[PDB]
Amino acid sequence: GGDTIFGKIIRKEIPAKIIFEDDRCLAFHDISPQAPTHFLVIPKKHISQISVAEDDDESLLGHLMIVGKKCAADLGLNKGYRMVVNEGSDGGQSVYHVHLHVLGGRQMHWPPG
Amino acid sequence: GGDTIFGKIIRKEIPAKIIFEDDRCLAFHDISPQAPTHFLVIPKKHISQISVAEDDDESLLGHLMIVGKKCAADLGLNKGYRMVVNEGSDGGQSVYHVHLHVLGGRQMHWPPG
């Protein structure tokens, strides 16, 4: 889904350290990790940014969190983690294809950036 | 919903600057902001933390996000923003009632804590 490097990964055109996959999303380790465990859960549907997600995409967005929570458990993150969604410039969004970050394996700090 | 502070805000026992409310959630300003605009979206249903959300909770979860992106827009966060959900000790989760932070109004940095 899409014209970003994330679309290419979804189409298996380029490799990724794929963690989990179903009919509507894909989870894989972040190529530039900011913690001992740092992964991403993305919808196969190309939604460029969270700000343009439709009301109808509600449960799908919720599914990215459920999948993230499940993957977190199976990667051994028993002491906690942080989920992050970045939007546009001030938010530091690196790829215009909606993605949920999950970071753990270390004490995350405050503020969150 | 709950034995926490969020419980008191949901039961309207303690005041908060509400930005939006419906039958499923509440969105209000964080009293200790880490950015010019800093608010929380919480489900009225008491879910202690994300690690324990049920599969049936995914629609509710995506709703917190849909509501977050709408409020961010109403609050004028056109340059971007960052959404964060903290889980447990390593995640910095202070209050054990699920809540989504929305931060904006300034450049957010990387890593997010």
- Read off the CATH number of the domain in which A49 is found: 3.30.428.10
3-class SS of residue B85: strand
Instruction: Say if residues B96 and B88 touch (Cβ distance below 8 Å).
Output: no
Hey, is the C-beta of B55 within 8 angstroms of any chain A C-beta? yes
| Domain boundaries, position B103 | 1-113
- Neighboring chain A residues of B75 at a CB cutoff of 8 Å: none
- Say if residue A43 is preceded by a cis peptide, omega within 30 of 0: no
Distant-in-sequence, close-in-space partners of B111: CB < 8 Å, separation ≥ 6: A34, A35, A103, A113
CA distances from A9 to A1, A12, A17, A97, B47 (A): 9, 5, 10, 12, 34
| Rounded CA separation A101/A70 (Å) | 14
What are phi and psi for residue B111, nearest 5 degrees? -70, 165
The residue with tokens 């009919």 is: A23
Domain count, chain B: 1
Identify how the structure was determined. Answer: X-ray
β-sheet with B81-87: strand ranges across: A18-21, A25-29, A37-43, A100-104, A81-87, B81-87, B100-104, B37-43, B25-29, B18-21
* Dihedral sign for Cα atoms in the order A76, B45, B4, B111: positive
Instruction: Say if residues B103 and B40 touch (Cβ distance below 8 Å).
Output: no
| Rounded CA separation B19/B23 (Å) | 14
Residue of A55, A59, A113 with shortest CB distance to B110: A113
Residue of A55, A101, A112 with shortest CB distance to B66: A55
| Rounded CA separation A59/B57 (Å) | 9
Among B60, B59, B72, residue whose Cα is nearest residue B101: B72
Contact A63 B62 (CB under 8 A): yes
**Exposed e or buried b per residue across A23-61, where buried means at least 16 C-beta atoms within 10 angstroms of its C-beta:** eebbbbebeeebbebbbbbbbbebbebbbebeeebbbbb
Q: Return the structure tokens found at A16.
A: 């990724």
